[PDB]
Scaffold this motif. Structure first.
Motif, short mmCIF file in Angstrom:
data_model
loop_
_atom_site.label_atom_id
_atom_site.label_comp_id
_atom_site.label_asym_id
_atom_site.label_seq_id
_atom_site.Cartn_x
_atom_site.Cartn_y
_atom_site.Cartn_z
N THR A 1 -1.26 -9.80 5.77
CA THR A 1 -1.87 -8.46 5.80
C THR A 1 -3.37 -8.49 5.52
O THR A 1 -4.03 -7.45 5.51
CB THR A 1 -1.21 -7.52 4.75
N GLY A 2 -3.91 -9.68 5.28
CA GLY A 2 -5.31 -9.81 4.88
C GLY A 2 -5.53 -9.46 3.41
O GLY A 2 -6.03 -10.27 2.62
N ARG A 3 -5.14 -8.24 3.04
CA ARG A 3 -5.24 -7.78 1.65
C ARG A 3 -3.89 -7.25 1.14
O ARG A 3 -3.34 -6.28 1.67
CB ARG A 3 -6.29 -6.67 1.54
N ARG B 1 -4.95 -12.55 -1.91
CA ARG B 1 -5.22 -13.20 -0.63
C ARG B 1 -3.91 -13.47 0.13
O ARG B 1 -3.23 -14.46 -0.13
CB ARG B 1 -5.96 -14.53 -0.87
N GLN C 1 -8.51 -0.32 -1.72
CA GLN C 1 -9.47 -1.09 -2.52
C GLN C 1 -10.81 -0.36 -2.69
O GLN C 1 -11.55 -0.62 -3.64
CB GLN C 1 -9.70 -2.47 -1.88
N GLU C 2 -11.13 0.56 -1.78
CA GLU C 2 -12.39 1.30 -1.85
C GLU C 2 -12.25 2.61 -2.63
O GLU C 2 -13.21 3.38 -2.75
CB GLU C 2 -12.93 1.56 -0.44
N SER D 1 0.83 -1.21 0.00
CA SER D 1 0.00 0.00 0.00
C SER D 1 0.86 1.26 0.00
O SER D 1 0.51 2.27 -0.62
CB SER D 1 -0.95 0.01 1.20
N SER E 1 -3.50 2.31 3.89
CA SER E 1 -3.71 0.86 4.03
C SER E 1 -4.54 0.26 2.89
O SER E 1 -5.42 0.91 2.33
CB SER E 1 -4.38 0.54 5.38
N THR E 2 -4.25 -1.01 2.56
CA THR E 2 -4.91 -1.71 1.44
C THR E 2 -6.44 -1.69 1.54
O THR E 2 -7.13 -1.48 0.55
CB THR E 2 -4.46 -3.20 1.36
N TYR E 3 -6.95 -1.91 2.75
CA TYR E 3 -8.40 -1.91 2.99
C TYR E 3 -9.04 -0.57 2.57
O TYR E 3 -10.19 -0.53 2.16
CB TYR E 3 -8.70 -2.20 4.47
N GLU E 4 -8.26 0.51 2.66
CA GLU E 4 -8.71 1.82 2.20
C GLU E 4 -8.51 1.95 0.68
O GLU E 4 -9.39 2.45 -0.04
CB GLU E 4 -7.91 2.93 2.91
N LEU F 1 -5.95 -7.13 -6.09
CA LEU F 1 -5.94 -7.59 -4.69
C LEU F 1 -5.58 -9.08 -4.57
O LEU F 1 -6.10 -9.92 -5.31
CB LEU F 1 -7.31 -7.33 -4.05
#
Length: 129
Positions: free
Chosen positions: A81-83, A77, A57-58, A34, A52-55, A75
């Protein structure tokens, strides 16, 4: 002489070739997935990317193998890091920060990434005024 996407991505990568993987602490002494994608788009394309990746991706809508874009965010798996996220440059190859070897260009033909590939998401607006 056009401002080519892949050209600018590799142009940015030319500065980070060989940097090790570090979560959050983005610098030449270590940078994460990220962090790397953040750097690339923020200073090359001038795009407002978070930390962060979770941010990440959105920031863009998802696509399939048929609708993959040059500079798309793919993305993976990754339990660490989860993502995980990489910058799709063409076909199946993408530039990103790998945990061990560091910032490199990987391929979805590689069994590890082939099963890792969950989906893709374009943060770049294809339409312009």
């Amino acid at each position: 002489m056009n401002v080519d996407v892949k050209s600018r991505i590799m142009d940015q990568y030319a500065d980070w070739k060989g940097v090790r993987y570090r979560l959050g602490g983005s610098t030449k002494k270590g940078i994460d997935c990220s962090g790397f994608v953040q750097r690339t788009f923020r200073e090359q394309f001038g795009l407002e990317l978070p930390r962060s990746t979770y941010e990440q991706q959105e920031m863009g809508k998802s696509v399939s193998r048929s609708n993959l874009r040059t500079g798309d965010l793919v993305l993976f798996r990754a339990g660490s890091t989860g993502r995980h996220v990489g910058i799709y440059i063409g076909n199946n190859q993408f530039v990103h920060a790998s945990t061990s070897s560091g910032v490199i260009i990987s391929s979805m033909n590689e069994p590890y990434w082939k099963k890792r590939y969950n989906e893709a998401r374009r943060v770049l607006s294809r339409s312009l005024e």
